[PDB]
Amino acid sequence: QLVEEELDRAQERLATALQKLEEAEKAADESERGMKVIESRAQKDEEKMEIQEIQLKEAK
Amino acid sequence: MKILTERGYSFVTTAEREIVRDIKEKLCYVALDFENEMATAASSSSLEKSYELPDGQVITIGNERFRCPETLFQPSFIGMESAGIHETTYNSIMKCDIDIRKDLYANNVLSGGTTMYPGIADRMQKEITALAPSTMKIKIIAPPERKYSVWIGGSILASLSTFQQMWISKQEYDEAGPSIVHRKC
Ligand SMILES: Nc1ncnc2c1ncn2[C@@H]1O[C@H](COP(=O)(O)OP(=O)(O)O)[C@@H](O)[C@H]1O
């Protein structure tokens, strides 16, 4: 019985492992979305900051 | 391209020349006072910006930012003997009749892409003001779209009704040869 019990127990544990992998990759997706939006925001903010600092430069 | 080698970056290809052109269009500006700007860049590091080549490999440049377009005002940096653009503008003015140069002093129109550096109008006005008499009103006219001024003016011209007789028709060419162009028009 050892054969089949290892078989089905490892199979259901492999199912749990693949579900954990799907959860992990969805976490990767959401983290990547946050990363991309935040880096785009950082880009816009930085370029605007540069425009404004050089504008103060010229103005003074 | 030549001044960036003293920081370690080496661009020799034509593609790399395009990369350096992009660096020039994005990071370079004209310093209102070149000497104290140089001393400031030497003292702090607040002028250093970073640029990312199209394979990663960020590069950071310091006083090159304003040493590149400074050549327009000191063409001796590239071994040329001419004078800066401010001085040739002033000379062209002082070569005109004394009655029109007061109205020329106040209508310096800037055009083309190389006049798009941040702070070029201020430096130009400072230099010409230092050269001209202390009574004239120096006005540098720098539109925000001066990179396409030639094309805009060309469309305005080609749209005028009184211009439709200034074309060089095919028949005039067939009569006169290619020399028609400068000989009459
Ligand atoms: N924003 C900018 N800042 C500095 N230099 C610029 C900028 N845009 C374009 N240039 C420079 O202008 C040149 C192209 O200008 P342009 O007026 O189109 O020349 P041309 O009329 O001869 O084609 C390029 O060599 C580039 O180095």
Side-chain angles (χ1 to χ4, degrees):
Chain A
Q1 193 54 96
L2 80 171
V3 195
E4 283 78 11
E5 63 84 28
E6 284 153 323
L7 162 64
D8 61 339
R9 290 187 306 101
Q11 282 311 108
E12 61 92 19
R13 288 171 281 162
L14 173 46
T16 63
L18 63 85
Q19 299 147 351
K20 176 63 191 30
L21 267 295
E22 305 324 286
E23 196 290 327
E25 64 88 19
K26 295 179 276 272
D29 309 330
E30 53 88 21
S31 199
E32 171 273 310
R33 276 154 186 73
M35 292 214 56
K36 68 177 293 297
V37 290
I38 285 185
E39 56 81 18
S40 43
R41 161 169 66 106
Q43 184 273 346
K44 318 167 214 317
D45 195 281
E46 288 289 41
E47 56 90 20
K48 182 43 65 186
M49 165 55 151
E50 298 139 12
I51 310 164
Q52 299 301 331
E53 64 201 78
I54 74 150
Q55 277 158 326
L56 169 81
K57 186 260 187 181
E58 315 294 338
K60 287 282 94 176
Chain B
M1 275 166 68
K2 174 245 178 182
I3 196 187
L4 272 177
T5 67
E6 59 199 32
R7 270 183 185 256
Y9 319 117
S10 199
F11 307 96
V12 292
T13 317
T14 53
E16 295 168 334
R17 187 147 48 100
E18 311 307 309
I19 298 176
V20 177
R21 186 182 47 73
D22 279 317
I23 297 175
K24 181 202 60 167
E25 299 169 16
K26 284 191 192 315
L27 297 191
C28 277
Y29 70 99
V30 184
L32 188 86
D33 198 328
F34 181 76
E35 292 294 334
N36 65 358
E37 191 82 17
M38 208 83 169
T40 296
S43 89
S44 88
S45 68
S46 41
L47 289 183
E48 294 192 27
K49 303 208 97 62
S50 306
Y51 184 80
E52 168 189 331
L53 312 184
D55 71 317
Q57 262 182 301
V58 302
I59 68 178
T60 71
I61 63 182
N63 57 11
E64 292 88 358
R65 305 181 62 206
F66 54 89
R67 283 168 66 201
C68 165
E70 177 70 18
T71 303
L72 291 163
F73 300 85
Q74 303 175 54
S76 89
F77 283 173
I78 66 174
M80 278 190 58
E81 212 203 17
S82 297
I85 49 180
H86 65 307
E87 208 166 335
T88 76
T89 290
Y90 172 76
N91 294 340
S92 182
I93 282 174
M94 277 280 159
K95 271 192 184 64
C96 294
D97 307 77
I98 195 181
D99 310 79
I100 74 170
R101 66 177 67 147
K102 189 257 287 178
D103 267 330
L104 258 51
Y105 270 137
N107 295 264
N108 305 267
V109 182
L110 260 54
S111 175
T114 318
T115 57
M116 273 289 196
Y117 295 97
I120 191 181
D122 291 329
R123 173 75 178 280
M124 179 85 47
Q125 181 167 3
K126 166 164 171 286
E127 297 292 296
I128 295 189
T129 293
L131 280 177
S134 67
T135 312
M136 310 270 97
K137 306 314 171 190
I138 310 305
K139 306 283 170 45
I140 307 295
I141 288 90
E145 78 288 0
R146 51 189 181 279
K147 194 179 154 194
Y148 315 95
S149 278
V150 172
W151 192 93
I152 290 167
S155 69
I156 287 172
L157 175 60
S159 301
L160 293 186
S161 316
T162 182
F163 179 79
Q164 310 305 133
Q165 299 86 234
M166 290 268 183
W167 295 110
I168 299 175
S169 89
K170 168 75 181 184
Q171 206 254 332
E172 293 162 273
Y173 172 79
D174 279 324
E175 289 161 349
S179 53
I180 185 67
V181 58
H182 37 68
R183 280 186 314 127
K184 267 85 79 176
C185 320

